[PDB]
Amino acid sequence: AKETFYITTPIYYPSGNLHIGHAYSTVAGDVIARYKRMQGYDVRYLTGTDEHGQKIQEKAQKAGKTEIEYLDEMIAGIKQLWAKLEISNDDFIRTTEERHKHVVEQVFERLLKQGDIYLGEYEGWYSVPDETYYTESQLVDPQYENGKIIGGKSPDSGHEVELVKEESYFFNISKYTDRLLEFYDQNPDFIQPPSRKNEMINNFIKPGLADLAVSRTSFNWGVHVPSNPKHVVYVWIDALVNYISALGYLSDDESLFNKYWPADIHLMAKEIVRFHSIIWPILLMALDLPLPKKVFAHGWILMKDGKMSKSKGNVVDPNILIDRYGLDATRYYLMRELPFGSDGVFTPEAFVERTNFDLANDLGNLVNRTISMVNKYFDGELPAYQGPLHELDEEMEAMALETVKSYTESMESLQFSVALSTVWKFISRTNKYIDETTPWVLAKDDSQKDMLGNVMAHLVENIRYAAVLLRPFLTHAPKEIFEQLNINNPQFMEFSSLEQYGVLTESIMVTGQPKPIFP
Ligand SMILES: COc1cc(C)c(Oc2cc(NCc3nc4ccccc4[nH]3)nc(N3CCN(C(C)=O)CC3)n2)cc1OC
Ligand SMILES: Nc1ncnc2c1ncn2[C@@H]1O[C@H](COP(=O)(O)OP(=O)(O)OP(=O)(O)O)[C@@H](O)[C@H]1O
Ligand SMILES: [Mg+2]
Ligand SMILES: [Mg+2]
Phi, psi of 280 (to 5 degrees): -60, -55
Name the residue of 8, 11, 13 to mutate for ligand 1: max ligand atoms within 8 A of Cβ.
13
HEC string of 428-469?
A: HHHHHHHHHHCHHHHCCCHHHHHHHHHHHHHHHHHHHHHHHH
Strands 301-303 and 306-307 turn out to be: antiparallel
Domain boundary among 215, 235, 255: 235
> Is-contact 184 291, C-beta < 8 A?
no
Q: How far apart are CA 20 and CA 28, in angstroms?
A: 12
Instruction: Identify the residue whose C-alpha is closest to ligand 2 atom 31.
Output: 268
Coil, strand or helix at 10: strand
In 3D, which of 464, 329, 330 has the Cα closest to residue 403?
Answer: 464
> How many Å apart are CA 274 and CA 496, to the nearest integer?
39
* Together in a domain, 408 and 287: no
The interaxial angle of helices 477-485 and 449-470, nearest 10 deg, is: 150
**Are 161 and 246 in a shared domain?**
no
End-to-end CA distance of the chain: give it in Å, rounded.
39
CA-CA distance, 457 to 442, in Å (whole number)? 14
- How many whole angstroms separate alpha carbon 302 and alpha carbon 270? 13
Return the residue whose CA atom lies nearest to atom 31 of ligand 1: 132
Q: What is the resolution of this structure in A?
A: 1.7
Q: Of 367, 404, 389, which Cα lies nearest the Cα of 437?
A: 389
Whether 8 contacts 33, CB under 8 Å? no
Residues 74, 163, single domain; the answer is no
Q: Cα–Cα distance between 493 and 467 in angstroms, integer?
A: 8
> Which secondary structure element, helix H or strand E, spans residue 486, and what is its range?
none
From the CA of 11, the nearest ligand is 1
Find the length of the chain.
Answer: 519
CATH number of residue 186's parent domain: 2.170.220.10
Residue 151 preceded by cis peptide, ω within 30: no
Statement to judge: residues 111 and 123 lie in one domain = no
Rounded to whole angstroms, how far apart are CA atoms 477 and 482?
9
Same domain, 243 and 204: no
With breaks defined as C to next N over 2.5 Å, after which residues does the chain break?
none
| 3-class secondary structure per residue, 381-429 | EECCCCCCCCCCHHHHHHHHHHHHHHHHHHHHCCCHHHHHHHHHHHHHH
Residue ranges around ligand 2 (CB below 6 Å): 10, 12-13, 21-22, 24-25, 268-269, 271-272, 300-301, 307-311
What is the number of other CB atoms lying within 10 angstroms of the CB of residue 278?
Answer: 23
Q: What is the DSSP letter of 247?
A: T
DSSP string, 97-160: SHHHHHHHHHHHHHHHHHTSEEEEEEEEEEETTTTEEE-GGG-EEEE-SSS---EEE-SSS-PB
Q: Which atom of ligand 1 is nearest to the CA of 134?
A: 30
> Atom 8 (ligand 2): residue with closest C-alpha?
21
How many Cβ atoms are within 10 Å of 393's Cβ, its own excluded?
A: 19
Let me know whether 384 and 464 are in one domain: yes
Q: Are residues 135 and 188 in the same domain?
A: yes
Residues surrounding ion ligand 3 at CB below 5 Å: 4
Q: What is the Cα Rg of the chain in Å?
A: 27
Q: Are strands 215-216 and 224-225 parallel, antiparallel or unpaired?
A: unpaired
Find the CATH number of the domain harbouring 42: 3.40.50.620
Q: Give the span between the Cα atoms of 167 and 52, in whole angstroms.
A: 19
> The CATH number of the domain where 495 resides is what?
1.10.730.10
Domain boundary among 295, 328, 346: 346
How many Å apart are CA 494 and CA 467, to the nearest integer?
10
Last residue of a domain, one of 185, 212, 235: 235
One-letter identity of residue 124 = G
∠ CA 40-46-52 to the nearest 5 degrees? Answer: 175
- DSSP characters for 259-290? HHPSPSEEEEEGGGHHIIIIIHHHHHHHTT-P
> Do residue 64 and residue 26 come from a single domain?
yes
Atom of ligand 1 nearest to the CA of 133: 31
The two most distant CA atoms of the chain are separated, in Å, by 101
Same domain for 139 and 98, yes or no, is: no
Residue 275 CA, closest ligand 1 atom number:
6
Give the dihedral of Cα atoms 329, 335, 337, 340; nearest 10 deg.
160
Residues 423, 407: contact at Cβ < 8 Å? yes
Structural domain harbouring 502: 347-519
215/275 same-domain check: no
Q: CA-CA distance, 485 to 209, in Å (whole number)?
A: 60
Neighbours of 228 (CB within 10 A): 15
Q: Which atom of ligand 1 is nearest to the CA of 132?
A: 31
Residue of the nearest CA to atom 6 in ligand 1?
236
> How was this structure obtained?
X-ray
- The 3-state DSSP class for residue 476 equals coil
Q: Count of domains in the chain?
A: 3
Q: How far apart are CA 81 and CA 318, in angstroms?
A: 8
Residues with Cβ within 8 Å of 499's Cβ and at least 6 positions away in sequence, in order, are: none
Give me the residues paired with residue 381 across strands: 509
**Residue 85 contacts residue 330 (beta carbons within 8 Å):** yes
Answer for the pair 31, 49: CB distance below 8 angstroms, yes or no: no
The residue whose CA is least distant from atom 29 of ligand 2 is 269
Quick one: 132 exposed, middle or buried, by C-beta within 10 A (0-12, 13-18, 19+)? middle
Residues 424, 474: one domain? yes
SS3 480: helix
Residue 322 and residue 196 share a domain: no
